[PDB]
UniProtKB/Swiss-Prot annotation, chain B:
The organism of origin for this protein: Ovis aries (Sheep)
Gene behind this protein: NNT
Binding site for NADP(+): 886, 918-923, 960-964, 979-980, 995-1002, 1021-1022
Protein name (Swiss-Prot/TrEMBL): NAD(P) transhydrogenase, mitochondrial
CDD domains: Rubrum_tdh
Protein keywords: Acetylation, Membrane, Mitochondrion, Mitochondrion inner membrane, NAD, NADP, Transit peptide, Translocase, Transmembrane, Transmembrane helix
Amino acid sequence: VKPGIPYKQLTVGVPKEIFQNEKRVALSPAGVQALVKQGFNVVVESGAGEASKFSDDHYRAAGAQIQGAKEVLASDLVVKVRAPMLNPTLGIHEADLLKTSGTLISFIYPAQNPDLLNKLSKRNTTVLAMDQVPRVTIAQGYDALSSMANIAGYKAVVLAANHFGRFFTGQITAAGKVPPAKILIVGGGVAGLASAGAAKSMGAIVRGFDTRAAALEQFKSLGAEPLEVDLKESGEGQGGYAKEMSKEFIEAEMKLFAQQCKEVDILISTALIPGKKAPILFNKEMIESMKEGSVVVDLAAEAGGNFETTKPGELYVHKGITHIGYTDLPSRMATQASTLYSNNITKLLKAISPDKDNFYFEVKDDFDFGTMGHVIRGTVVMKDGQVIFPAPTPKNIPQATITPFRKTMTSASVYTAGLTGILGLGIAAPNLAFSQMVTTFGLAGIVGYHTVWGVTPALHSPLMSVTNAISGLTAVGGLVLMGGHLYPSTTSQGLAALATFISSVNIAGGFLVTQRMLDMFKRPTDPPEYNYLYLLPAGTFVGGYLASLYSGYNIEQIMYLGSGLCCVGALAGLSTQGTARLGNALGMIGVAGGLAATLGGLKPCPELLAQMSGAMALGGTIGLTIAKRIQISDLPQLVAAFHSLVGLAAVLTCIAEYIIEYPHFATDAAANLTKIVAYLGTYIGGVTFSGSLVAYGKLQGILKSAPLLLPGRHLLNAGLLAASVGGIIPFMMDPSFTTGITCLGSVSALSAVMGVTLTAAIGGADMPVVITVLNSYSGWALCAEGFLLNNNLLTIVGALIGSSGAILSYIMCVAMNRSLANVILGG
Amino acid sequence: VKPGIPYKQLTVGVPKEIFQNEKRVALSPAGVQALVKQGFNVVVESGAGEASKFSDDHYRAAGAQIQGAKEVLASDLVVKVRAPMLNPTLGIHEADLLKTSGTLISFIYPAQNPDLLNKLSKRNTTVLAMDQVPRVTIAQGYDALSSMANIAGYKAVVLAANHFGRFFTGQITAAGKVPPAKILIVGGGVAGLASAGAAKSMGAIVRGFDTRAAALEQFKSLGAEPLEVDLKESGEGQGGYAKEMSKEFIEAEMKLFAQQCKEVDILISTALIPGKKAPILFNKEMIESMKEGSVVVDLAAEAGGNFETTKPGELYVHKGITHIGYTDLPSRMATQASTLYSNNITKLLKAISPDKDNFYFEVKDDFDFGTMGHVIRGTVVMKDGQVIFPAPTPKNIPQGAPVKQKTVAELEAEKAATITPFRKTMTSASVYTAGLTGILGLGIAAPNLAFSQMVTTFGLAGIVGYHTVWGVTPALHSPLMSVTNAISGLTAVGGLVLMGGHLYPSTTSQGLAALATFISSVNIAGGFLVTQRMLDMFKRPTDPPEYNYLYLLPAGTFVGGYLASLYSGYNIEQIMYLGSGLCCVGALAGLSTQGTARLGNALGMIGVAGGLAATLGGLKPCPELLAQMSGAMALGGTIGLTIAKRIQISDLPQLVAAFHSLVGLAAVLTCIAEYIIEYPHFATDAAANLTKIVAYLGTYIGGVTFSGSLVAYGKLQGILKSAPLLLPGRHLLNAGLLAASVGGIIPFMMDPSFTTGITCLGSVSALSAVMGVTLTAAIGGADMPVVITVLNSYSGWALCAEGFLLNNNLLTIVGALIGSSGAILSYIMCVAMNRSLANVILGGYGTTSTAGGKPMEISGTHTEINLDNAIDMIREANSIIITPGYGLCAAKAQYPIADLVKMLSEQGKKVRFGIHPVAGRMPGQLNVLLAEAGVPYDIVLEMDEINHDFPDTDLVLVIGANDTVNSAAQEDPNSIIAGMPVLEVWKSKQVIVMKRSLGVGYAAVDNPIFYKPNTAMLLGDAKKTCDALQAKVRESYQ
Ligand SMILES: NC(=O)c1ccc[n+]([C@@H]2O[C@H](COP(=O)([O-])OP(=O)(O)OC[C@H]3O[C@@H](n4cnc5c(N)ncnc54)[C@H](OP(=O)(O)O)[C@@H]3O)[C@@H](O)[C@H]2O)c1
Ligand SMILES: NC(=O)c1ccc[n+]([C@@H]2O[C@H](COP(=O)([O-])OP(=O)(O)OC[C@H]3O[C@@H](n4cnc5c(N)ncnc54)[C@H](O)[C@@H]3O)[C@@H](O)[C@H]2O)c1
Ligand SMILES: NC(=O)c1ccc[n+]([C@@H]2O[C@H](COP(=O)([O-])OP(=O)(O)OC[C@H]3O[C@@H](n4cnc5c(N)ncnc54)[C@H](O)[C@@H]3O)[C@@H](O)[C@H]2O)c1
């Protein structure tokens, strides 16, 4: 036997209210269907919902039974709204018609009704209180006082108009301004904020006030203008309630209200402190200072009132302003209130006995906070005649490190170190050509910095290919170092032939995979453009050049400027999704013009010309035929596959220079730079080679996605870099061919090891950043090749590619929320 | 003598209303201040305002004169609400108590009341019916039936609740959810739309319905659910009024309403057909099908009804449904009814006699549909005792098809359809092949390698400068120009190279290039002082203290690091030129983020010092010639410092236009100075034809930059006149000057004689100065800032000229940095207005978005208030956006404005500034004036950053601006400034414009923002009005 009594033997009782002009009923038909869902039997008195606009047909259909009056209160559960009284119709008190040990669910206010408690102790019954329910978090779904405060506030707002003779909203008609009404609200609780919301939505403006700090914040939340009192007091008593305030605070607040009273139109006071009367906040000399036609509502007329002038129940128009001072506000919205009050009981009755049919609710003396035993102890006022109204105490709980002088110091430090670096580059100059080349270098660097900045996340990899294609222009270093006859006779010419063979593949394949990374945007609704019109510069620029070689005009430098500006136009126009085709075409024209210019920059032997033509032709054919037969899903896969050659070509070119310039060294002015910069070029190209190989291998499923950690993870890179830097001292001005060539071999092999070590432990989710990083490195190899060869095109193009690739790597780090240091070095 | 009886001996009378349960009164105390400002005398019956809460003290203090009843009715004008009825308190008709041949103002309803018109014809009176006013476009302010319908439609909603049982709004309460209430409307007139507004703002569900097509659209603009029926008969009859329907349409409509009547809770029927009774649209068994507790409100209870169950003056609960069938809804809100009806009678009496004082008011017979004569003929029912109530037909009738509504930005989208993508691609591909032909042409003209290197560094400097100028803050364009006038002082480098001799100059060439150094050393010190005085006005007083003297640390590192590199025997001058060039690029690049501005000034100082020191060390003179150079530069810097610290900031553009002219002189005094000093080399040189052509072109460029700048000075200071001097043929003369200038290179070549070349130099200098004076004075005093900035480009290019001429590498990078800056500023200012550069320079008509003829005309009247409305309306507002113009700083009125804003943001308001790009006499001028007055830079917004906050804005103070707030830029396709991006100030709650009088500044004969009904004028001088606002804010807040 479970501890309780099943729901079939119990019955609830809904009487009508004999109290004066009471219109609401205890249960709606929405609440009669519940508890029949749960299991009770519902007995409803006949004339019960008629003032509440609930006909008896909904009660007969909802599961109840319309019956008399002497037996509705004689039920196991009596659910009223107001506490029982002396019935004048039957001549008997309503407690005398209750049964023995019944259950009553009502408003009680037991501290204000001693004799009702005595008469219910005579009937030896169990009484719960709807008004003693503690306001905790879990019990806010069943709070009768909050619901009645909400409806009373809405009723006061909707009742203020229909007596106020002007608008609340106000509009600029084309007939004159009408200004809005200005409403003041005293006391932000449940009624006041609901009033503020109903008034703010209707069109007026609100300037509410309360002594607490949270209610003012909620006025700011609802859109009100909270008032601030000068005297900085508190507003809290034993929790989040209101205490009786000091007289200095009262006379400051009344001065504030006397200031505000001359300008508002509707004053809705809702001040009420617990356990005492309502605070008087308005004098008769204070309230008569309003305009004629103002409407002034008090909602605390039950326990006194907020005014010196309130007849509780009348609408006497005291000196041209109306007092709305009813004490029964929810009774005028009985169809509304009897819903929410019914919802306040159903959610009570589902919670106190949360099972099939037992109806038990253990009333225990120990309770802490927030637990339902807290609610059960607070709610039950009488248990079997014996009164437990003083509830006990709650248990356990009732709830610039940078100092910005140093910013200016480090900024001035950066600029003064930069100006010293410019001076140090100036001191070590061999001739005028180096100074001129550093000038066009620095300008190309700034041009390359500013020229991306506007790309779209759809367009990271569709431009990288073009940079690949523009970094395919290492082939000029092969073109300025072949010679002899049709076959390459010397080993320097052989290395140059290898370089310009392997670097034609990059050009042809990079532009074709650009063309294939632009076809994957063309939806089948787009207007047919005309790309062949973009051939109109090219024959003008390449072929129109050739007559100048037929007319004896030696045009190479202005051609280099033209190809550099076309490459800038490529990178620029390929950055905003509308002009990507234009950028692709300008990159093609830039490469073609540069290679034709450097081709005419030798006037070679006809067999030598046939050699260079055959080498570039075979390289371009291979670069086409790889890039064409492949999928689409391997296009960003492919770029590193055509990037790995690129720096390798630079390495060969650097080595080629050291082989061609070694007999010229003994009687040389510019002798150190054409070894130091060649050494750095070898380093950069070798790292580019091995790193792009590891990039492709990690993207082609040869290796994993996991960064392969090592024991030596930065000692190892430190040792590689230390040997790499100390590889420049074994040719301190040495006359040996042998130690120079083995230094070149040493830095090449160690650069390969370094690229493997860096690009290995990365992870295939930052590898499209790493492609931009190596594509950024190769531009500096191109600038080194320019310094070796004294060629403006390679200097401009290399600086452009370098700064653009590095800035795109930074923007790709900006797209996600990572840095670059925590990405690369294994943070 | 003028035809009329003046207002002084013309009195009015306001009686108390005598009709049963009438609480309205015809004139408010707010309504008797007009008609007293207009000129009448006002007599009010002693108890007329007591019903609508108007105390008699407000009358007698408003300008009224309290009397009894028999003498208020025998007045020269009687103004009341209803028709004058039989007085019960003494049995006599109120037409008997009228003055003989007087005039009456009320509702009449003459067709329903000819018997009262008999009594009016016996007394030979003139009658103005309020109800018979035809509803035309110039008659919105005086439409009494619309106002009464508006109040009735609101009052029906607010009276339906307090009788309905539950919420309208509905929310998710923790006790449980409640659904919103359903409200049906029948017939969207004016009352139905007001009820729809009142129901939608309270959070309800509105599903109104009407026969006419546009009323359903206005429902769904108000947010209702506009219903429909499955039968298609056109509801409209003769006009905007409806008509009777077919019987079967009535059957289908009552079927639709019987289908939805079982669902809604509130229903308001405003169906009212003119000429006969209101249609019955609901049966009594149809309406008992609703829920128990619904509220049914009928607004047609007087003229029949929309229900067969409506008691015409009472509530009753018929089987659980309340029937609010009140016949006088506006008589319950007598205060608001009296105020609106008073406004209607006020605007009627103001509109009928627009004469100052005659009150003539003639009735005419032939009129156009819509004119005032139409309203006068349709309104006067009895004219001098005889009946003229059947109105004649409106001749010259419009409305064959009245639909244009062609907004401005629609036209350029239509023009975008002409731009077929073949032609887009083709016009893109022509520009690049033109550029590559330009590259090949510049290639062919190369004499050697060094010129090609100079072309390459010129092109890269141009791109660097182009990208770094778009990076600047839009709030710093005016320091920007000043620092360019600093950096353009590097023609001193052009001066010192050709400068030789001893303590004194020896030849004439050495004397020209000492004058060049002298007039260039003004620009350096002057530009850096005026940039320094401008950048520390942007420093807020709460900023961290700025330790700028640390930036002397790089300079002595660089420049002094040069000297020990010169003392030890090196040649770093080509690297010093690069270092100074990068410092000059950084001078604008750091001038981009408002916190590094003084950084970007000190870098300019370091670069100019390094460049001058580098050129000097490369010269290695005797200490006599070094002493001459030091004397020249110190004297020039003395004068440049001592004129930069004397002026005000608002006299800055003159100084800016003064700094260009000196550079335009200096290039001329450096080009000639090389043509003389390079003369014994021309026969034995290959580049000799190069350094002549450049030595031509620079003389042209400075030759235009000089003279025109003096005119651009001379108009802006006021020495020359503000009116553009137009010549009869000035297009032929300017083109002929340009033809002579381009033809002057033909004798300059092919003919190596000394005298014939120097006279070509003098010829091109003279004709270029004439070209500048001719083009400059024909511009106009408004568009003159364009001549400020475009010349700033030319002063750049002159620098580029001598960078090709002296084979120097700093001058090209600096000049390409400056000329790009001038070009981009001129482009921005020719975008901010929709004009083109040829339209500005050559003086065409209007903007580029100008269509053909007939711009639109104004409609409506202008509202003007005083300081007291102004201060109380400032006090109530909680978001103020201020748009100043040039007229603010023309009258020195920014000093009270900054104090006003500092006062109003202590109170807790949100006050900001919105600055149009061309407000002022210089790009970015008004930012500096507002920073001088003391506004922190964080509340000064541009046009693009603030133009979508005008709907969320209480009050906008337009100060001294007309064309930057003109609305016709976005509405009239024929206005003179259509398409110009403006401020959308009319999209807010209330607008104040402060100017002297209702006139124009430069164009736009009338601004249509002055007449929209939430625009208040505050005419007066801005100086006294703004500091009076300062004084009132101080006296009232303290
Ligand atoms: N800023 C530039 O760089 C630049 C460049 C090229 C062209 N523009 C021209 O500049 C124009 C600027 O137009 P905007 O809207 O700023 O001005 P606006 O349209 O020319 O009108 C200025 C207004 O200020 C009023 N005003 C003048 N002095 C006043 C004072 N002491 N107190 C009060 N009000 C005073 C004038 O009223 P009253 O005259 O009736 O007294 C006038 O209505 C543009 O339309 C453009 O055509 C500017
Ligand atoms: N879930 C929960 O437990 C829960 C939820 C919401 C609110 N609450 C509590 O319930 C209360 C909500 O307010 P209510 O309307 O129910 O109570 P209430 O009827 O006591 O409200 C009276 C209002 O008048 C204010 N007031 C009191 N003395 C004043 C004075 N001298 N001057 C000006 N204003 C004065 C009070 O601050 C309050 O805003 C708050 O105390 C809040 O902490 C609890
Ligand atoms: N630009 C203009 O010309 C303009 C602008 C605004 C207003 N106006 C005038 O003001 C008038 C505003 O209307 P009002 O409120 O003064 O007149 P009203 O109160 O008589 O309107 C009656 C309403 O009931 C509707 N109705 C008529 N017969 C019906 C039927 N059988 N069933 C259902 N609905 C029916 C009408 O369409 C109208 O919406 C317009 O009709 C027009 O003449 C004109």
